[PDB]
Amino acid sequence: PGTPEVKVASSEDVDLPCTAPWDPQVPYTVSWVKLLENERPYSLKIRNTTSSNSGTYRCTLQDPDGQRNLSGKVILRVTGS
């Protein structure tokens, strides 16, 4: 609900977008997780996608001062064959 979705055919590559509402002119570092229980900045590259890559992912951007971070979620659905 409210979470954007990326659909990709199996065996294709995908750059999963970071959906955190980040600040321009801030040099973030990015860390990605999968929640179990290309000219766009901060995307997660997933090569040769398979059915098991489907799920919900979370991107976290860390401000260089180490005092703030921002997170956003995105769903991946792998299809085709």
Side-chain angles (χ1 to χ4, degrees), residues 1-36 38-66 68-81:
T3 305
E5 300 187 4
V6 176
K7 289 178 185 177
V8 63
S10 196
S11 87
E12 225 54 29
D13 299 343
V14 67
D15 276 304
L16 285 189
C18 164
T19 62
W22 72 79
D23 292 341
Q25 313 313 322
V26 174
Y28 301 100
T29 60
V30 61
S31 72
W32 279 92
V33 303
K34 185 178 181 181
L35 305 175
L36 310 170
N38 180 79
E39 302 294 352
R40 202 183 150 101
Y42 309 127
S43 291
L44 173 74
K45 182 97 149 192
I46 302 181
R47 301 189 182 271
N48 293 301
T49 56
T50 59
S51 195
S52 62
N53 297 133
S54 294
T56 301
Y57 293 75
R58 183 189 74 216
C59 67
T60 301
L61 299 171
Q62 170 171 334
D63 204 293
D65 57 27
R68 293 176 286 279
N69 60 58
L70 326 170
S71 65
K73 289 174 194 171
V74 60
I75 297 162
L76 172 64
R77 299 178 65 188
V78 178
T79 53
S81 301

Coordinates of all heavy atoms in Angstrom, one line a residue, unseen atoms left out:
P1 N 0.8 -1.2 0.0 CA 0.0 0.0 0.0 C 0.9 1.3 0.0 O 1.6 1.5 1.0 CB -0.9 0.0 1.2
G2 N 0.8 2.0 -1.1 CA 1.6 3.2 -1.2 C 3.0 3.0 -1.6 O 3.8 3.9 -1.8
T3 N 3.3 1.7 -1.8 CA 4.7 1.3 -2.1 C 4.8 1.1 -3.6 O 4.0 0.2 -4.2 CB 5.2 0.1 -1.3 OG1 5.0 0.4 0.1 CG2 6.6 -0.2 -1.6
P4 N 5.7 1.8 -4.3 CA 5.7 1.6 -5.8 C 6.3 0.2 -6.1 O 6.9 -0.5 -5.3 CB 6.7 2.7 -6.3 CG 7.5 3.0 -5.1 CD 6.7 2.8 -3.9
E5 N 6.0 -0.3 -7.4 CA 6.4 -1.6 -7.8 C 7.1 -1.6 -9.1 O 6.8 -0.9 -10.0 CB 5.1 -2.5 -7.9 CG 4.3 -2.6 -6.6 CD 3.2 -3.7 -6.8 OE1 3.1 -4.3 -7.8 OE2 2.4 -3.8 -5.8
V6 N 8.2 -2.4 -9.1 CA 8.9 -2.7 -10.3 C 8.7 -4.1 -10.8 O 8.8 -5.0 -10.0 CB 10.4 -2.5 -10.1 CG1 11.2 -2.9 -11.3 CG2 10.7 -1.1 -9.6
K7 N 8.2 -4.3 -12.0 CA 8.1 -5.6 -12.6 C 9.1 -5.8 -13.7 O 9.4 -5.0 -14.5 CB 6.7 -5.8 -13.2 CG 5.6 -5.9 -12.2 CD 4.2 -6.1 -12.9 CE 3.1 -6.1 -11.9 NZ 1.8 -6.2 -12.5
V8 N 9.8 -7.0 -13.7 CA 10.8 -7.3 -14.6 C 10.7 -8.8 -15.1 O 10.4 -9.6 -14.3 CB 12.2 -7.0 -14.0 CG1 12.5 -7.9 -12.8 CG2 13.3 -7.2 -15.0
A9 N 11.0 -9.0 -16.3 CA 11.0 -10.3 -16.9 C 12.3 -11.1 -16.4 O 13.3 -10.5 -16.2 CB 11.1 -10.3 -18.4
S10 N 12.1 -12.4 -16.1 CA 13.1 -13.2 -15.6 C 14.3 -13.2 -16.5 O 14.2 -13.1 -17.7 CB 12.6 -14.7 -15.5 OG 13.4 -15.5 -14.7
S11 N 15.5 -13.3 -15.9 CA 16.8 -13.3 -16.6 C 17.3 -11.9 -17.1 O 18.4 -11.8 -17.6 CB 16.8 -14.4 -17.7 OG 16.3 -13.8 -18.9
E12 N 16.4 -10.9 -17.0 CA 16.8 -9.6 -17.3 C 17.5 -8.9 -16.1 O 17.3 -9.3 -15.0 CB 15.6 -8.8 -17.8 CG 15.9 -7.9 -19.1 CD 16.4 -8.7 -20.2 OE1 16.1 -9.9 -20.3 OE2 17.2 -8.2 -21.1
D13 N 18.3 -7.9 -16.3 CA 18.8 -7.1 -15.2 C 17.8 -6.0 -14.8 O 16.9 -5.6 -15.5 CB 20.1 -6.4 -15.6 CG 21.2 -7.3 -16.1 OD1 21.1 -8.6 -15.7 OD2 22.2 -6.9 -16.7
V14 N 17.9 -5.5 -13.5 CA 17.1 -4.4 -13.1 C 17.9 -3.5 -12.2 O 18.7 -4.0 -11.4 CB 15.8 -4.9 -12.4 CG1 16.1 -5.6 -11.1 CG2 14.8 -3.8 -12.2
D15 N 17.7 -2.2 -12.3 CA 18.2 -1.2 -11.4 C 17.0 -0.8 -10.5 O 16.2 0.0 -10.9 CB 18.8 -0.1 -12.1 CG 20.3 -0.3 -12.5 OD1 21.1 -0.7 -11.6 OD2 20.6 -0.3 -13.7
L16 N 17.0 -1.3 -9.3 CA 15.9 -1.0 -8.3 C 16.1 0.4 -7.8 O 17.1 0.8 -7.3 CB 15.9 -2.0 -7.1 CG 15.4 -3.4 -7.3 CD1 15.3 -4.1 -6.0 CD2 14.0 -3.3 -8.0
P17 N 15.1 1.3 -7.9 CA 15.2 2.7 -7.5 C 15.1 2.9 -6.0 O 14.3 2.3 -5.3 CB 14.0 3.3 -8.3 CG 13.0 2.2 -8.3 CD 13.7 1.0 -8.5
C18 N 15.9 3.8 -5.5 CA 15.9 4.3 -4.2 C 14.7 5.3 -4.1 O 14.7 6.3 -4.8 CB 17.2 5.0 -3.8 SG 17.1 6.0 -2.3
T19 N 13.7 5.0 -3.2 CA 12.5 5.9 -3.1 C 12.6 6.9 -2.0 O 11.6 7.6 -1.7 CB 11.3 5.1 -3.1 OG1 11.3 4.3 -1.9 CG2 11.2 4.1 -4.3
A20 N 13.7 6.9 -1.2 CA 13.9 7.9 -0.2 C 13.9 9.3 -0.8 O 14.5 9.5 -1.9 CB 15.2 7.7 0.5
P21 N 13.1 10.3 -0.2 CA 13.0 11.7 -0.7 C 14.2 12.6 -0.3 O 14.2 13.4 0.5 CB 11.8 12.2 0.1 CG 11.8 11.4 1.3 CD 12.2 10.0 0.9
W22 N 15.4 12.3 -1.0 CA 16.6 12.8 -0.5 C 16.9 14.3 -0.9 O 16.1 14.9 -1.8 CB 17.8 11.9 -1.0 CG 18.1 12.0 -2.5 CD1 18.8 13.0 -3.1 CD2 17.8 11.1 -3.5 NE1 18.9 12.7 -4.5 CE2 18.3 11.5 -4.7 CE3 17.1 9.9 -3.5 CZ2 18.2 10.8 -5.9 CZ3 16.9 9.2 -4.7 CH2 17.5 9.6 -5.9
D23 N 17.9 14.9 -0.3 CA 18.2 16.3 -0.6 C 19.2 16.4 -1.7 O 20.2 15.7 -1.8 CB 18.8 17.0 0.7 CG 17.8 17.1 1.8 OD1 16.6 17.0 1.6 OD2 18.3 17.3 3.0
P24 N 19.0 17.3 -2.6 CA 20.0 17.6 -3.6 C 21.2 18.2 -2.9 O 21.2 18.7 -1.8 CB 19.4 18.6 -4.5 CG 18.3 19.3 -3.7 CD 17.8 18.2 -2.8
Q25 N 22.4 18.0 -3.5 CA 23.7 18.5 -3.0 C 24.1 17.9 -1.7 O 24.9 18.5 -1.0 CB 23.6 20.1 -2.9 CG 23.0 20.8 -4.2 CD 23.6 20.3 -5.5 OE1 24.8 20.0 -5.6 NE2 22.8 20.2 -6.5
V26 N 23.5 16.8 -1.3 CA 24.1 16.0 -0.2 C 24.7 14.7 -0.7 O 24.1 14.0 -1.4 CB 23.0 15.7 0.9 CG1 23.5 14.8 2.0 CG2 22.4 17.0 1.5
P27 N 26.0 14.5 -0.2 CA 26.7 13.3 -0.8 C 26.4 12.0 0.1 O 27.3 11.6 0.8 CB 28.2 13.7 -0.7 CG 28.2 14.7 0.4 CD 26.9 15.4 0.6
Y28 N 25.2 11.5 0.0 CA 24.8 10.3 0.7 C 25.7 9.1 0.4 O 26.2 8.9 -0.6 CB 23.4 10.0 0.4 CG 22.4 11.0 0.8 CD1 21.9 11.9 -0.2 CD2 21.9 11.2 2.1 CE1 20.9 12.8 0.1 CE2 21.0 12.2 2.4 CZ 20.5 13.0 1.4 OH 19.6 13.9 1.7
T29 N 25.7 8.2 1.4 CA 26.1 6.8 1.1 C 24.8 5.9 1.2 O 23.9 6.2 1.9 CB 27.2 6.3 2.1 OG1 26.7 6.3 3.4 CG2 28.4 7.1 2.0
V30 N 24.8 4.9 0.4 CA 23.5 4.1 0.3 C 23.7 2.7 0.8 O 24.8 2.1 0.6 CB 23.0 4.1 -1.1 CG1 23.9 3.4 -2.1 CG2 21.6 3.4 -1.2
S31 N 22.8 2.2 1.6 CA 22.8 0.7 1.9 C 21.4 0.1 1.7 O 20.4 0.7 2.0 CB 23.2 0.5 3.4 OG 22.2 0.9 4.3
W32 N 21.4 -1.1 1.1 CA 20.1 -1.7 0.7 C 19.9 -3.0 1.5 O 20.9 -3.7 1.8 CB 20.2 -2.1 -0.8 CG 19.9 -1.0 -1.8 CD1 20.7 -0.1 -2.3 CD2 18.6 -0.6 -2.3 NE1 20.1 0.8 -3.2 CE2 18.7 0.5 -3.2 CE3 17.3 -1.2 -2.1 CZ2 17.7 1.0 -3.9 CZ3 16.2 -0.6 -2.8 CH2 16.4 0.5 -3.6
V33 N 18.7 -3.3 1.8 CA 18.3 -4.6 2.3 C 17.1 -5.2 1.7 O 16.3 -4.4 1.0 CB 18.1 -4.6 3.9 CG1 19.3 -4.0 4.6 CG2 16.8 -3.8 4.2
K34 N 16.9 -6.5 1.7 CA 15.6 -7.1 1.3 C 14.9 -7.5 2.6 O 15.4 -8.0 3.5 CB 15.9 -8.3 0.4 CG 14.6 -8.9 -0.1 CD 14.9 -10.1 -1.0 CE 13.5 -10.7 -1.5 NZ 13.8 -11.9 -2.4
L35 N 13.6 -7.1 2.7 CA 12.8 -7.3 3.9 C 12.1 -8.7 3.8 O 11.4 -8.9 2.9 CB 11.8 -6.2 4.1 CG 12.3 -4.8 4.1 CD1 11.1 -3.8 4.1 CD2 13.2 -4.5 5.2
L36 N 12.4 -9.5 4.7 CA 11.9 -10.9 4.7 C 10.8 -11.2 5.7 O 9.9 -12.0 5.5 CB 13.1 -11.9 4.8 CG 14.2 -11.6 3.9 CD1 15.4 -12.5 4.3 CD2 13.9 -11.9 2.5
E37 N 10.9 -10.4 6.8 CA 10.0 -10.7 8.0 C 9.6 -9.4 8.6 O 8.9 -9.4 9.7 CB 10.7 -11.6 9.0
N38 N 22.3 3.2 -16.4 CA 21.4 3.7 -15.4 C 21.9 5.0 -14.8 O 23.0 5.1 -14.3 CB 21.1 2.7 -14.3 CG 20.2 3.3 -13.3 OD1 18.9 3.3 -13.5 ND2 20.7 3.7 -12.1
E39 N 21.1 6.0 -14.9 CA 21.5 7.4 -14.4 C 20.7 7.8 -13.2 O 20.8 9.0 -12.8 CB 21.3 8.4 -15.6 CG 22.0 8.0 -16.9 CD 23.6 8.1 -16.7 OE1 24.1 8.5 -15.7 OE2 24.3 7.7 -17.7
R40 N 20.0 6.9 -12.6 CA 19.3 7.3 -11.3 C 20.3 7.0 -10.1 O 20.7 5.8 -10.0 CB 18.0 6.5 -11.1 CG 17.1 7.2 -10.1 CD 15.8 6.4 -9.9 NE 15.3 6.7 -8.5 CZ 14.3 7.5 -8.3 NH1 13.6 8.1 -9.2 NH2 13.9 7.7 -7.0
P41 N 20.6 8.0 -9.3 CA 21.5 7.8 -8.2 C 20.9 6.8 -7.2 O 19.7 6.8 -7.0 CB 21.5 9.2 -7.5 CG 21.3 10.2 -8.7 CD 20.3 9.4 -9.6
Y42 N 21.8 6.0 -6.6 CA 21.5 5.2 -5.4 C 20.7 3.9 -5.7 O 20.2 3.3 -4.8 CB 20.8 6.0 -4.3 CG 21.6 7.3 -4.0 CD1 20.9 8.5 -4.0 CD2 22.9 7.3 -3.7 CE1 21.6 9.7 -3.7 CE2 23.6 8.5 -3.4 CZ 23.0 9.7 -3.5 OH 23.7 10.8 -3.2
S43 N 20.6 3.6 -7.0 CA 19.8 2.4 -7.4 C 20.6 1.1 -7.0 O 21.8 1.1 -6.9 CB 19.5 2.4 -8.8 OG 18.6 3.4 -9.1
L44 N 19.8 0.0 -6.8 CA 20.4 -1.2 -6.5 C 20.4 -2.1 -7.8 O 19.4 -2.4 -8.3 CB 19.7 -2.0 -5.4 CG 20.2 -3.4 -5.2 CD1 21.5 -3.5 -4.5 CD2 19.1 -4.2 -4.4
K45 N 21.6 -2.5 -8.3 CA 21.7 -3.3 -9.5 C 21.5 -4.8 -9.1 O 22.2 -5.4 -8.3 CB 23.0 -3.2 -10.2 CG 23.1 -4.0 -11.5 CD 22.8 -3.1 -12.7 CE 23.6 -3.5 -13.9 NZ 23.4 -2.5 -15.0
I46 N 20.5 -5.4 -9.8 CA 20.3 -6.8 -9.6 C 20.4 -7.5 -11.0 O 19.6 -7.2 -11.9 CB 18.9 -7.2 -9.0 CG1 18.8 -6.5 -7.6 CG2 18.8 -8.7 -8.9 CD1 17.5 -6.8 -6.9
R47 N 21.4 -8.3 -11.2 CA 21.7 -8.9 -12.5 C 21.0 -10.3 -12.6 O 20.8 -11.0 -11.6 CB 23.2 -9.1 -12.8 CG 23.9 -7.7 -12.7 CD 25.3 -7.9 -13.2 NE 26.1 -6.6 -13.2 CZ 26.1 -5.7 -14.2 NH1 25.5 -6.0 -15.3 NH2 26.8 -4.6 -14.0
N48 N 20.6 -10.7 -13.8 CA 20.1 -12.0 -14.1 C 19.0 -12.4 -13.2 O 19.0 -13.5 -12.6 CB 21.2 -13.0 -14.2 CG 22.1 -12.8 -15.3 OD1 21.8 -12.8 -16.5 ND2 23.4 -12.6 -15.0
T49 N 17.9 -11.6 -13.1 CA 16.8 -11.7 -12.1 C 16.2 -13.1 -12.2 O 16.0 -13.7 -13.3 CB 15.8 -10.7 -12.3 OG1 15.3 -10.7 -13.7 CG2 16.3 -9.3 -12.0
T50 N 15.8 -13.6 -11.1 CA 15.0 -14.9 -11.0 C 13.8 -14.7 -10.1 O 13.8 -13.7 -9.3 CB 15.9 -16.1 -10.5 OG1 16.4 -15.8 -9.2 CG2 17.0 -16.3 -11.4
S51 N 12.9 -15.6 -10.1 CA 11.7 -15.6 -9.3 C 12.0 -15.3 -7.8 O 11.2 -14.6 -7.1 CB 11.0 -16.9 -9.4 OG 9.6 -16.9 -8.9
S52 N 13.1 -15.8 -7.3 CA 13.4 -15.7 -5.9 C 13.8 -14.2 -5.5 O 13.8 -13.9 -4.3 CB 14.4 -16.7 -5.4 OG 15.6 -16.5 -6.1
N53 N 14.2 -13.4 -6.5 CA 14.5 -12.0 -6.2 C 13.3 -11.2 -5.9 O 13.4 -10.0 -5.4 CB 15.2 -11.4 -7.4 CG 16.6 -12.1 -7.7 OD1 16.8 -12.4 -8.9 ND2 17.4 -12.3 -6.7
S54 N 12.1 -11.7 -6.2 CA 10.9 -10.9 -5.9 C 10.7 -10.7 -4.4 O 11.1 -11.5 -3.6 CB 9.6 -11.7 -6.4 OG 9.6 -11.9 -7.8
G55 N 10.2 -9.5 -4.1 CA 10.0 -9.2 -2.7 C 10.1 -7.7 -2.4 O 10.0 -6.9 -3.4
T56 N 10.2 -7.3 -1.2 CA 10.2 -5.9 -0.8 C 11.6 -5.5 -0.4 O 12.3 -6.2 0.4 CB 9.2 -5.6 0.4 OG1 7.9 -6.0 -0.1 CG2 9.2 -4.2 0.8
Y57 N 12.1 -4.4 -0.9 CA 13.4 -3.9 -0.7 C 13.4 -2.5 0.0 O 12.4 -1.8 -0.2 CB 14.3 -3.8 -2.0 CG 14.6 -5.2 -2.6 CD1 13.6 -5.9 -3.3 CD2 15.8 -5.7 -2.5 CE1 13.8 -7.1 -3.9 CE2 16.1 -6.9 -3.1 CZ 15.1 -7.6 -3.8 OH 15.4 -8.9 -4.3
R58 N 14.4 -2.2 0.8 CA 14.5 -1.0 1.5 C 15.8 -0.3 1.3 O 16.9 -0.9 1.5 CB 14.2 -1.1 3.0 CG 14.2 0.2 3.8 CD 14.2 0.0 5.3 NE 15.5 -0.4 5.8 CZ 15.7 -1.3 6.8 NH1 14.7 -1.8 7.4 NH2 16.9 -1.6 7.1
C59 N 15.8 0.9 0.9 CA 17.0 1.7 0.7 C 17.2 2.7 1.8 O 16.3 3.3 2.2 CB 17.0 2.4 -0.7 SG 15.8 3.8 -0.7
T60 N 18.4 2.8 2.3 CA 18.7 3.7 3.4 C 19.9 4.7 3.0 O 21.0 4.2 2.6 CB 19.1 3.1 4.7 OG1 18.0 2.2 5.1 CG2 19.4 4.1 5.8
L61 N 19.6 6.0 2.9 CA 20.7 6.9 2.6 C 21.2 7.5 3.9 O 20.5 8.1 4.7 CB 20.1 8.0 1.7 CG 19.5 7.5 0.3 CD1 18.8 8.7 -0.4 CD2 20.7 7.0 -0.5
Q62 N 22.5 7.5 4.0 CA 23.2 8.1 5.2 C 23.9 9.4 4.9 O 24.7 9.5 4.0 CB 24.2 7.1 5.8 CG 25.1 7.7 6.9 CD 25.9 6.6 7.6 OE1 25.6 5.5 7.7 NE2 27.1 7.1 8.1
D63 N 23.5 10.4 5.6 CA 24.2 11.7 5.5 C 25.6 11.5 6.0 O 25.9 10.8 7.0 CB 23.4 12.7 6.4 CG 23.6 14.2 6.0 OD1 24.8 14.7 6.1 OD2 22.7 14.8 5.5
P64 N 26.6 12.2 5.3 CA 28.0 12.1 5.7 C 28.4 12.5 7.1 O 29.4 12.0 7.6 CB 28.7 13.0 4.6 CG 27.7 13.0 3.5 CD 26.4 12.9 4.1
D65 N 27.6 13.4 7.7 CA 27.9 13.7 9.1 C 27.5 12.6 10.0 O 27.9 12.6 11.2 CB 27.1 15.0 9.5 CG 25.6 14.9 9.3 OD1 25.0 13.8 9.4 OD2 25.0 16.0 9.1
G66 N 26.8 11.6 9.5 CA 26.5 10.4 10.3 C 25.4 10.7 11.3 O 25.1 9.9 12.2
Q67 N 24.7 11.8 11.2 CA 23.7 12.2 12.2 C 22.3 12.0 11.7 O 21.3 12.0 12.5 CB 23.9 13.7 12.5
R68 N 22.1 11.7 10.4 CA 20.8 11.6 9.8 C 20.8 10.5 8.8 O 21.7 10.3 8.0 CB 20.3 12.9 9.1 CG 20.0 14.0 10.0 CD 19.7 15.3 9.3 NE 20.8 15.8 8.6 CZ 21.7 16.6 9.2 NH1 21.5 16.9 10.5 NH2 22.8 17.1 8.6
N69 N 19.7 9.7 8.7 CA 19.5 9.0 7.5 C 18.0 9.0 7.0 O 17.1 9.4 7.7 CB 20.0 7.5 7.6 CG 19.4 6.7 8.7 OD1 18.2 6.5 8.7 ND2 20.2 6.2 9.6
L70 N 17.8 8.5 5.8 CA 16.5 8.5 5.1 C 16.3 7.2 4.5 O 17.2 6.6 4.0 CB 16.4 9.6 4.0 CG 17.2 10.9 4.2 CD1 17.1 11.6 2.9 CD2 16.6 11.7 5.3
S71 N 15.0 6.6 4.6 CA 14.7 5.3 4.0 C 13.4 5.3 3.2 O 12.5 6.1 3.5 CB 14.7 4.2 5.1 OG 13.7 4.4 6.0
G72 N 13.4 4.4 2.2 CA 12.3 4.3 1.4 C 12.2 2.9 0.9 O 13.2 2.2 0.9
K73 N 11.0 2.4 0.6 CA 10.8 1.0 0.2 C 10.3 0.9 -1.2 O 9.7 1.8 -1.8 CB 9.8 0.3 1.1 CG 10.3 0.1 2.5 CD 9.1 -0.4 3.4 CE 9.5 -0.3 4.9 NZ 8.4 -0.6 5.8
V74 N 10.6 -0.3 -1.8 CA 10.1 -0.6 -3.2 C 9.9 -2.1 -3.3 O 10.6 -2.9 -2.7 CB 11.2 0.0 -4.2 CG1 12.5 -0.7 -4.1 CG2 10.6 -0.3 -5.7
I75 N 8.9 -2.5 -4.1 CA 8.6 -3.9 -4.4 C 9.1 -4.3 -5.7 O 9.0 -3.5 -6.7 CB 7.1 -4.1 -4.3 CG1 6.6 -3.8 -2.9 CG2 6.8 -5.6 -4.7 CD1 5.1 -3.7 -2.8
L76 N 9.8 -5.5 -5.8 CA 10.2 -6.0 -7.0 C 9.3 -7.3 -7.3 O 9.2 -8.1 -6.5 CB 11.7 -6.4 -7.0 CG 12.2 -7.2 -8.2 CD1 12.1 -6.3 -9.5 CD2 13.6 -7.6 -8.0
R77 N 8.8 -7.4 -8.5 CA 8.1 -8.6 -9.0 C 8.8 -9.1 -10.2 O 8.8 -8.4 -11.3 CB 6.6 -8.4 -9.2 CG 5.9 -7.9 -8.0 CD 4.4 -7.6 -8.3 NE 3.7 -8.8 -8.7 CZ 2.5 -8.9 -9.1 NH1 1.8 -7.7 -9.3 NH2 1.9 -10.0 -9.5
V78 N 9.4 -10.3 -10.2 CA 10.0 -10.9 -11.3 C 9.1 -11.8 -12.1 O 8.4 -12.7 -11.4 CB 11.3 -11.6 -10.9 CG1 12.0 -12.3 -12.1 CG2 12.3 -10.7 -10.2
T79 N 8.9 -11.7 -13.4 CA 8.0 -12.5 -14.2 C 8.7 -13.0 -15.4 O 9.9 -13.1 -15.5 CB 6.7 -11.8 -14.6 OG1 7.1 -10.5 -15.2 CG2 5.9 -11.5 -13.4
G80 N 7.9 -13.4 -16.4 CA 8.4 -14.1 -17.6 C 8.9 -15.5 -17.3 O 8.2 -16.2 -16.6
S81 N 10.0 -15.9 -18.0 CA 10.7 -17.1 -17.6 C 12.0 -17.2 -18.3 O 12.3 -16.5 -19.3 CB 9.8 -18.4 -18.0 OG 8.6 -18.4 -17.4

